[PDB]
Design a protein around this nucleic acid. Structure first.
Ligand SMILES: [Mg+2]
Ligand SMILES: [Zn+2]
Ligand SMILES: [Zn+2]
Lengths: 78, 293, 156, 96, 231, 1138
DNA sequence: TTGTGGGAGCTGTCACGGATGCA
DNA sequence: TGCATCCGTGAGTCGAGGGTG
RNA sequence: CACCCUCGA
């Protein structure tokens, strides 16, 4: 599983990606929080809507549209 | 007197002698008794786990004997065996013959983790492996001054790796710090011209075992030399008891400002000229020089 | 010791040790052997416990003996002792140092029985716990120095 | 979390009450780990329920696997979902 | 022992077969004895480091007037005095507590001087045969020792600083040339430092008195009649 | 001189004063003869029958005879084993080394089962197992690695007496112990009080009268034999009980604590302990020793060898009369046996078990464990349904053989630095190991040189480290007796006449006679010229004895010397310390690309090289038919062909290069035994461990200060000290918990430039040049879902690219290692190959490096003069002779005289003499100095090859004379005067050096201690997951240990912050080390250190011992040493853009 | 769970002090 | 209850390479 | 991980 981690590797993993970070910053705060609570943490849709105190429709629509914007903005596989 | 020395201690602030008898045995966390995997599905055996396993087996058999209403002789045998297994778990071989393993080796008990030269105290608390440190064969190199030393290029590059990465990011050789690490690892020629800068006025510690007195570790100013050998001033040999019949010395790199100051001031080579034992000179011309003069 | 007093046994031991080291022809100044011998005479045996809580025959520090005598004389048969360096090292006030030095199991049992609390102020203790040692640049008067330029230089 | 500036260190005999207070559970079986799945066995010397989870934020049966549900305890396997770094500071006990 | 037959040949002429075979025995014996001697030296050095590591300089001056008398020289019936060989190890690098009287008004030294080579030569030229110095033994320091009672630092040559941990330096100084003691030797050093009752015990006089020797067979009997009137 | 016993051997003129009456035996016979005895080979059969032994019993035959028959408890059935037969080998040596197999042969036995009830007989042929076989080089191959079984030194079985001064009373107490080859010990000791106790199986001491009456000896019958001794009478007066059966039950009550006794079980147990051949066995060696030490039987009946009662009585009488000390001792029936204590280290009482006996002792345990299962199946299986196959289980025998050859201390990784290292390793004798003494019992007395080691075990060759005296090489002419004793040859002398009859004597048979010396004057008729001769006596007493009392004489000088030690020219001119160092450093020399036989040597290089095995030797005379760089094909005179394949660039166990090259041309006629191709360190047949270098002895600008060495850059430019080093890297793709790994070229996040030297499989291509960090084999591992970073999880959730998820675990090149890729071996699971459980693919990549000589590399001569290379100057800076020939190496003067190795100066003089040649002045006869030794040495051409045998060879006067006959160079100049010195010119300034400097030619070796192997550094790397300290070892990229003494030094300096930094933020602080790296990267100040994790581990381990340890605050407040949960999430949410 | 059955290894270390066990 | 005995301590540092359970 | 073998100063 986990290897023998040095302080070098440990300090370098603590640094930002600096590429996915820019793409997250380019999305509006609403899309960003939506995709963060949906795809990063793994909440269900109703729980994310409860966190954002907004109905299900807006949460789901923001999720889909922010997903499309990030898919069009990153376009970097390896 | 000998008996009072024991009783008066128990006579204070609770501390009942009941602790000398156990109704429950503590179990050390599993990380401090790891179990690694070998080739072909084989597994490594931590002796502590085997001792705990014997204790648990005998305790379970004792409970099964109690509930089954066995003859008191058999239950007493099981109680004695449980006591002996806990005795082995805590300190094996202390009473009776030790508990053997594969090849009749005595199982390392909980007491063995602290006893001896290689126990916790002497082997992991009083002395430890350190980062930013290396070693190599020493050559003479009589050209450098008393306060200098020869440091191979590869050794110096590995020791100052974060410093040279930082300086490579300062100048625009590397875009980010991870690319700087990759560039240092690939040994691209831009690192060396940077290395000589980060070494300037950054003392290192040279040590040779056995360190009999404090002069067995001394601070020097590293000068980049070609090769894979550490050039060592010919006067400090008397302090190090170091000849060049194949001797190796180790280099430690101080990082904090206080440590670098202690190296430059307290441990500098040209500062310790006299033996702290008799006050006689040790950096004095030793044999060849003697004839030369 | 019991005939000529401790200040004579110190001279005798230093002279004999330096006699051996000179018979082998080694330049060892007497002050090192004196520093070592000084620690062999730092305790006293109690013949009569008196008004204190010392157990008779137990080795207690001389300064501790005197100081606790002053506390009980405000509201005591001590005899100077010469003990080996091993027995002196094991008689230290810090149970951690004694446990790391030698005979770990016995030291740990004895320290658990007496519920010993280590003051945690010694070179080896601070080494083990990872604290700045109480010597050299670790002394309070050296480690807490305040540094700031002078006003005449702060102007320039 | 620590400044290495404290007064003293104390030792003494531990009572069975102190031992049970320390322990996060009791080991009941000599089993170490399931060899077919490389997983710890329940109520054993390596049991995750009493000692802790081997993988970060992952319970035994695989119900909760993310940092989203932290501090809670999986009701199906009893494993607390937290860092595996607790597997070196959580002791067990044996009731004799 | 020493074999009755010696090795007469030099290594320039080349030893014979039997000379070489006999020399090898001593060679390997010496290698093994050194292998054990270095370990004994390490053990003693570790014990000294542990017993002395609480000894550091903690104040400037003990202010005690106590001290140790050091012999600077002894003299023959002739005016010429013989220089005591221990001056470098006993008198040098000390600080004195009582000034040199010099048999006249002249006080050759001030209380607390370095006692360097010129001070020693000036005391020897004046005719003073004994001095009293500050000693680490007679210090009244509550914790550790004082800088003035200890003396100068061997490495720096000046007065020892405060932060110096003289106990470990002393243990290292004593144990570093430990691998040089050969056979009354290093076991004697260990017997002294461990405070053991010696193998051969030579008693001393219990009190001043007139001695009486009684010579038997393989057993003496010494009886001292004291001056205090006791038994 | 010629030494023509080996055909085609180069002509090495010898200064030998004497003639060799016996030749060096087979140097590997100590292994091969033992193994052949174990097997029962026709070689061993003929040898034993020819040597005089008409009782041929192989080791396996012996074990089978001892095991047969296997009777049941009912006595109804029996199983007998016969005829140990070996099928042909499974695979060749090179094939086994390639495929990680063990060179082995199947073992078959004829197992005859007999049922007495029905009276039926069923023979069969049962498969016993794969018996590992010994190669022709005397070694074994185990799991693909080459190993050697070192002979073990153990005390022979028998009765031994010793003298011990009393602890308090000083009264000498004599003790005795009976040690069998297998079974229970039997000790008899006298006490401070006059009591004679018998300690049986180390139980509490009981009166000897108890055992005497237990044997059946009545009281009146026991008092008689010990009547003259009052100690036995005084013990019988202090006896507890008196009687036979009561003493039996007393012995039973003593031997079994906590057991109700019984007289029947007492008798049965006492009989089974020492008198039953099953549980107790005194070997043939033990019976021979006890019959020679007690004089019981002189007719030599080998039968009935188990603790005869008369032997016990005779031992007790020997002890009670030893307390008195009468020389003559005669038990009833005894024969004039002396009374004395026994020397434990005497080679008459200290035998050695060779490889055959160790394998036999392991097979004994295996076969006993098999016999247990045999008798267990005999009762549970139905009769007439059993065959010898079903009764026999070969699992424990195979397990025992594997355990021996894999884990025994005597099975050792073969030393393969050069041919000499392996040759000595095979003849090495070790004192430690199972059955013998352990290391903590190794006192100073067992390690010293004993007088019985003369001509048996070399006193010079032995390690310097903690194994000193516990490891020693066998002597040249020595051999092992069938009893396990080391014998040595001597010439028999008859009334002052030395004959050509050689007799081999053991240590016992030698102390009874008077052994002469080899250098004694002997005329042509074979008689001592001098009236008295210097000889050795029983206890090692050296004395002069008239020539009429000499019994035997040394066959040769250097008889007390080993192979490696006998290769040091002018050995007798060196002290034992530096001679030992030279003998040990000859085995550390690496093979060079081109070999060069020493200009000055001994007579040992040739035969040592040819007997080592790394040279190619013709098995039969014939003409070479074909010669290639790959093999040599010869055509014998009878028409048969033979072919010898060449080992080309083969890696050794220690990374040195084993390479062979043919030394013959097509059409040459070679004789049987001639060298046909040279090995790694062989030159035309002789051991060429180094190079002949031009040395000048003078201090030079301090670059040779304190054993440093200065080299000429020519040695770099011409590759005269360049060596080849091969390393084997290995990686396997296996199964994980998440799936299966794959070896592929497709690596995520890797440029196509870095993969440029990889083929389609992802393996580097043959011949590619790889550097530090380059990829050798590409491997990808199924990535654990838990460790997926938030960014990777976001990407895999956005794009949904859940296909072929892997992580990079590809093999890379370690730090400080580079070279050309030589070969690639690959084993797959798709193809049918043997791999361990779950391992799908395995790939080995071999990389070679050409290392030139460099700074810090370790050189050394043959005389213990070692040194690392301080500076390599250009050829112009080097001081040069008159004609412009620069020296090659500059050795400092201050080193030579204080080490007591003057042999190097003599070697240098003789090396110049052989390099320039000489001619003794023939005008007016032969001078007085050249009269004694030299016959064919009166002239010699330039670059002549000469040998100075040790304890023989060039005398000082002869070297002095040769230093004057030095032939001029091509210009007529004599460059070296008669003092051996020469005027050199400083190549830097130009002015000639004022005084003449000793120059000449010396044999210099390249020891296997190079900077490329030793330099190491580590800023940050892996940590051990238990104590969280940096790892250890250069191979694991580990840190350097800051031990206890280093901390003492740091404290004595008073550098508190340095000591804290070393022990907290460099070693144990898990949050402080990453903080320090992050601070250095961003150029900030170093933070404050935290708490060492090993201290927390100590606290937890104390808690494991029921010790309530609690760190208190300033005033009695419990402090919690924990982590802090959310300190990490803030920076993560910040760098994700919260 | 039914005629019989009891280990492998080893003292080949030396010095010292003080609790233990016995006369 | 008065010692002799037995048992339980301690016995150099650092480094390199190779194995197996 | 633990233990073993060989070796260097
Ligand atoms: Mg050296
Ligand atoms: Zn669960
Ligand atoms: Zn003072």
């Amino acid at each position: 599983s986990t290897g023998l981690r040095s302080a070098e590797v440990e300090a370098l993993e603590a640094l930002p990606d600096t590429e996915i970070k820019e793409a997250l910053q380019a999305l509006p705060e609403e899309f960003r929080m939506a995709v963060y609570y949906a795809d990063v943490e793994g909440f269900p849709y109703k729980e994310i809507a409860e966190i954002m105190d907004t109905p299900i429709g807006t949460v789901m629509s923001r999720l889909h549209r922010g997903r499309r914007q990030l898919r069009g903005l990153l376009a970097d596989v390896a | 007197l000998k008996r009072l020395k024991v009783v008066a201690a128990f006579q204070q602030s609770g501390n009942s002698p009941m602790g000398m008898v156990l109704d429950a045995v503590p179990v050390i966390p599993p990380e401090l008794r790891p179990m690694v995997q070998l080739d072909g599905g084989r597994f490594a055996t931590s002796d502590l786990n085997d001792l705990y396993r014997r204790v648990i087996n005998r305790n379970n058999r004792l409970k099964r004997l109690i509930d089954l209403g066995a003859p008191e002789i058999i239950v007493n045998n099981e109680k004695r065996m449980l006591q002996e297994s806990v005795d082995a778990l805590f300190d094996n071989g202390r009473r009776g013959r030790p508990v053997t393993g594969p090849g009749n080796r005595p199982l390392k008990s909980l007491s063995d983790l602290l006893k001896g030269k290689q126990g916790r105290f002497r082997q992991n608390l009083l002395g430890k492996r350190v980062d930013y440190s290396g070693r190599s064969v020493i050559v003479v190199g009589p050209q450098l001054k008393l306060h200098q030393c020869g440091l191979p290029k590869l050794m110096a590059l590995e020791l100052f790796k974060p410093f040279v990465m930082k300086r490579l990011v300062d100048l625009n050789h590397a875009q980010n710090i991870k690319s700087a690490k990759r560039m240092v690892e690939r040994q691209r020629p831009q690192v060396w011209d940077v290395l000589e800068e980060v070494i300037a006025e950054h003392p290192v510690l040279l040590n040779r075992a056995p360190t009999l007195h404090r002069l067995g570790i001394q601070a020097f100013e590293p000068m980049l030399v070609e090769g894979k050998a550490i050039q060592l001033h010919p006067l400090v040999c008397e302090a190090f008891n170091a000849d060049f019949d194949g001797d190796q010395m180790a280099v430690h790199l101080p990082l904090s400002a206080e440590a670098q100051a202690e190296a430059r001031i307290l441990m500098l080579s040209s500062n310790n000229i006299l033996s702290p034992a008799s006050g006689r000179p040790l950096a004095m011309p030793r044999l060849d020089m003697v004839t030369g003069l | 010791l019991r005939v000529q007093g401790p200040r004579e046994v110190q001279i005798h031991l230093v002279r004999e040790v330096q006699e051996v080291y000179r018979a082998q022809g080694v330049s060892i100044h007497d002050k090192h052997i004196e520093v070592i011998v000084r620690q062999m005479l730092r305790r006293v045996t109690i013949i009569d416990s008196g008004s204190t809580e010392f157990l008779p025959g137990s080795l207690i520090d001389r300064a501790e003996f005197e100081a606790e005598n002053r506390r009980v004389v405000a509201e005591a048969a001590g005899r100077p002792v010469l003990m080996g360096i091993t027995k002196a090292s094991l008689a230290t006030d810090s149970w951690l140092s004694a446990a790391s030095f030698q005979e770990t199991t016995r030291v740990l049992t004895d320290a658990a029985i007496n519920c010993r609390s280590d003051k945690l102020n010694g070179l080896k203790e601070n080494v083990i716990i990872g604290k700045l040692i109480p010597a050299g640049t670790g002394i309070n008067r050296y480690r807490n120095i305040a540094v700031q330029p002078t006003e005449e230089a702060r102007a320039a | 979390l620590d400044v290495n500036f404290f007064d003293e260190l104390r030792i003494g005999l531990a009572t069975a009450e102190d031992i049970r207070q320390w322990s996060y559970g009791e080991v009941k079986k000599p089993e170490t780990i399931n060899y077919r799945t490389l997983k710890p066995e329940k109520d054993g010397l390596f049991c995750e329920k009493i000692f802790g989870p081997t993988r970060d934020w992952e319970c035994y049966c695989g119900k909760y696997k993310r940092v989203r549900f932290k501090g809670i305890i999986c009701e199906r396997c009893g494993v607390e979902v937290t860092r595996a770094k607790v597997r070196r500071e959580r002791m067990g006990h044996i009731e004799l | 022992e020493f074999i009755p037959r010696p090795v007469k040949s030099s290594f320039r002429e080349g030893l014979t077969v039997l000379e070489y075979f006999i020399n090898t025995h001593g060679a390997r014996k010496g290698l093994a004895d050194t292998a054990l001697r270095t370990a004994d030296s390490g053990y003693l050095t570790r014990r000294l480091v542990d017993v002395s590591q609480d000894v550091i300089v903690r104040e400037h001056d003990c202010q005690t007037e106590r001290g140790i008398v050091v012999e600077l020289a002894e003299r023959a019936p002739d005016g010429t005095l013989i220089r005591d060989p221990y001056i470098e190890t006993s008198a040098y690098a000390r600080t004195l507590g009582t000034d040199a009287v010099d048999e006249a008004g002249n006080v050759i030294v001030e209380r607390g001087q370095d006692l360097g080579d010129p001070e020693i030569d000036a005391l020897l030229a004046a005719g003073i045969t004994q001095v009293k110095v500050r000693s680490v033994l007679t210090c009244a320091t509550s914790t550790g020792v004082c800088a003035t009672c200890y003396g100068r630092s061997m490495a720096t040559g000046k007065l020892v600083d405060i932060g110096e941990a003289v106990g470990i330096v002393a243990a290292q100084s004593i144990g570093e040339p430990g691998t040089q003691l050969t056979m009354g030797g290093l076991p004697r050093v260990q017997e002294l430092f461990e405070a053991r009752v010696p193998r051969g015990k030579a008693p001393i006089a219990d009190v001043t008195g007139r001695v009486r020797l009684e010579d038997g067979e393989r057993f003496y009997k010494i009886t001292i009649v004291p001056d205090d009137g006791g038994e | 001189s010629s030494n023509n016993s080996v055909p085609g051997a180069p002509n090495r003129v010898s200064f030998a004063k004497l003639r060799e009456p016996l030749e060096v035996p087979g140097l590997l016979d100590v292994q091969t003869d033992s193994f052949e005895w174990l097997i029962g080979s026709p070689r061993w059969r003929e040898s034993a029958a020819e040597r005089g032994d008409v009782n041929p019993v192989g080791g396996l035959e012996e074990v089978l005879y001892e095991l047969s028959p296997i009777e049941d408890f009912s006595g109804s059935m029996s199983l007998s084993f016969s005829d140990p037969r070996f099928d042909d080998v499974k695979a060749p040596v090179d094939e086994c080394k390639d495929k990680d197999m063990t060179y082995a042969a199947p073992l078959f036995v004829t197992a005859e089962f007999i049922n007495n009830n029905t009276g039926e007989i069923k023979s069969q042929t049962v498969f016993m197992g794969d018996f590992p076989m010994m190669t022709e080089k005397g070694t074994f191959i185990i799991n693909g690695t080459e190993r050697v079984v070192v002979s073990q030194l153990v005390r022979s079985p028998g009765v031994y007496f010793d003298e011990t001064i009393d602890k308090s009373t000083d009264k000498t107490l004599h003790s005795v112990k009976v040690i069998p080859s297998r079974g229970a010990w039997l000790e008899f000791d006298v006490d401070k009080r006059d009591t004679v106790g018998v300690r049986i199986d180390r139980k509490r001491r009981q009166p000897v009268t108890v055992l005497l009456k237990a044997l059946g000896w009545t009281s009146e019958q026991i008092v008689e034999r010990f009547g003259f001794s009052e100690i036995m009478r005084s013990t019988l007066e202090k006896d507890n009980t008196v009687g036979t059966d009561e003493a039996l039950l007393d012995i039973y009550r003593k031997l079994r604590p906590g057991e109700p006794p019984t007289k029947e079980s007492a008798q049965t147990l006492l009989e089974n302990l020492f008198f039953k051949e099953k549980r107790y066995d005194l070997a043939r060696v033990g019976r021979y020793k006890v019959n020679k030490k007690l004089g019981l039987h002189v007719g030599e009946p080998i039968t009935s060898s188990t603790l005869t009662e008369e032997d016990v009585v005779a031992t007790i009488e020997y002890l009670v009369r030893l307390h008195e000390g009468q020389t003559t001792m005669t038990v009833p029936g005894g024969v004039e046996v002396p009374v004395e204590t026994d020397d434990i280290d005497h080679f008459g009482n200290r035998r050695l078990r060779t490889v055959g006996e160790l394998i036999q002792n392991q097979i004994r345990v295996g076969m006993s464990r098999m016999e247990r299962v045999v008798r267990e199946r005999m009762t549970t299986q139905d009769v007439e349904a059993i065959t010898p196959q079903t009764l026999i289980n070969i699992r424990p025998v195979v397990a025992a053989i594997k355990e021996f050859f894999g884990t025994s201390q005597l099975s050792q990784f073969m030393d393969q630095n050069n041919p000499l290292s392996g040759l000595t390793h095979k003849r090495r004798l070790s004192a430690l190991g199972p059955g013998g003494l352990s290391r903590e019992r190794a006192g100073l007395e067992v390690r010293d040189v004993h007088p019985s080691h003369y001509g048996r075990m070399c006193p010079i060759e032995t390690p310097e480290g903690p194994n000193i005296g516990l490891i020693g090489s066998l002597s040249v002419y020595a051999r092992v007796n069938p009893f396990g004793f080391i014998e040595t040859p001597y010439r028999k002398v008859v009334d002052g006449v030395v004959s050509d009859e050689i007799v081999y004597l053991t240590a016992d048979e030698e102390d009874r006679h008077v052994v002469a010396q080899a250098n004694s004057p002997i005329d042509a008729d074979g008689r001592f010229v001098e009236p008295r001769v210097l000889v050795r006596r029983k206890a090692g007493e050296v004395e002069y004895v008239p020539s009429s009392e000499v019994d035997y004489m040394d066959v040769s000088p250097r008889q007390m010397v080993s192979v490696a030690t006998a290769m040091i020219p002018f050995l007798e001119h060196d002290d034992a310390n530096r001679a030992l160092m030279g003998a040990n450093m000859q085995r550390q020399a690496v093979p060079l690309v081109r070999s060069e036989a020493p200009l000055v040597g001994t007579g040992m290089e040739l035969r040592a090289a040819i007997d080592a095995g790394d040279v190619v030797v013709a098995e039969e005379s014939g003409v070479i038919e074909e010669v290639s760089a790959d093999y040599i094909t010869v055509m014998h005179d009878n028409g048969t062909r033979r072919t010898y394949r060449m080992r080309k660039f083969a890696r050794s166990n220690h990374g040195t290069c084993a390479n062979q090259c043919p030394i013959v041309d097509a059409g040459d006629r070679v004789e049987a035994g001639q060298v046909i191709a040279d090995g790694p360190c062989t030159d035309d047949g002789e051991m060429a461990l180094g190079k002949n270098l031009l040395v000048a002895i003078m201090p030079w600008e301090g670059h040779n200060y304190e054993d440093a060495i200065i080299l000429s850059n020519r040695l770099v430019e011409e590759d005269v000290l360049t060596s080849i080093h091969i390393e084997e890297h290995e990686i396997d793709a296996r199964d994980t918990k998440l799936g299966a790994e794959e070896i592929t070229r497709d690596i995520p996040n890797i440029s196509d430039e870095v993969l440029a030297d990889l083929d389609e499989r992802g393996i580097v291509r043959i011949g590619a040049e790889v550097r530090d960090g380059d990829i050798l084999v590409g491997k990808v591992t199924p990535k654990g879902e838990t460790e997926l970073t938030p960014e990777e999880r976001l990407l895999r959730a956005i794009f949904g690219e859940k296909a072929r998820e892997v992580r990079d675990t590809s093999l890379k090149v370690p730090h400080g290692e580079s070279g050309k890729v030589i070969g690639i071996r690959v084993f797959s699971r798709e193809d049918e190959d043997e791999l361990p459980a779950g391992v799908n693919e395995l790939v080995r990549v071999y990389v070679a490096q050409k290392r030139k000589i460099s700074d810090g590399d370790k050189l050394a001569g043959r005389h213990g003069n070692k040194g690392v290379i301080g500076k390599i100057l250009p050829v112009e800076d080097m001081p040069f002779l008159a004609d412009g020939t620069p020296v090659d190496i500059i050795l400092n003067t201050h080193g030579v005289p204080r080490r007591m190795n003057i042999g190097q100066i003599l070697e240098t003089h003789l090396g110049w003499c052989a390099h320039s040649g000489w001619k003794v002045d023939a005008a007016k006869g032969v001078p007085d100095w050249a009269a004694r030794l030299p016959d064919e040495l009166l002239e010699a051409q330039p670059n002549a090859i000469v040998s100075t045998p040790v304890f023989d060879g060039a005398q000082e006067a002869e070297l002095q004379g040769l230093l004057s006959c030095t032939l001029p160079n091509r210009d007529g100049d004599v460059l070296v005067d008669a003092d051996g010195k020469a005027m050199l010119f400083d190549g830097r300034s130009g002015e000639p050096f004022p005084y003449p400097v000793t120059v000449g030619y010396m044999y210099i070796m390249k020891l296997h201690h190079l900077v490329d192997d030793k330099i190491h550094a580590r800023s940050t790397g892996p940590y051990s997951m238990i104590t969280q300290q940096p790892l250890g070892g250069k191979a694991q990229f580990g840190g350097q240990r800051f031990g206890e003494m280093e901390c003492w030094a740091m404290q004595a300096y008073g550098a508190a912050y340095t000591l804290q930094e070393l022990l907290t933020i460099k070693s144990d602080d898990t949050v402080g080390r990453v903080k320090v790296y992050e601070a250095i990267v961003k150029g900030e100040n170093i933070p404050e250190p935290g708490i060492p994790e090993s201290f927390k581990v100590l606290l937890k381990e104390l808690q494991s011992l029921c010790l309530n340890v609690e760190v208190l605050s300033s005033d009695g407040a419990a402090i919690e040493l924990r982590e802090g949960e959310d300190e990490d999430l803030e920076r993560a949410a910040a760098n994700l853009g919260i």
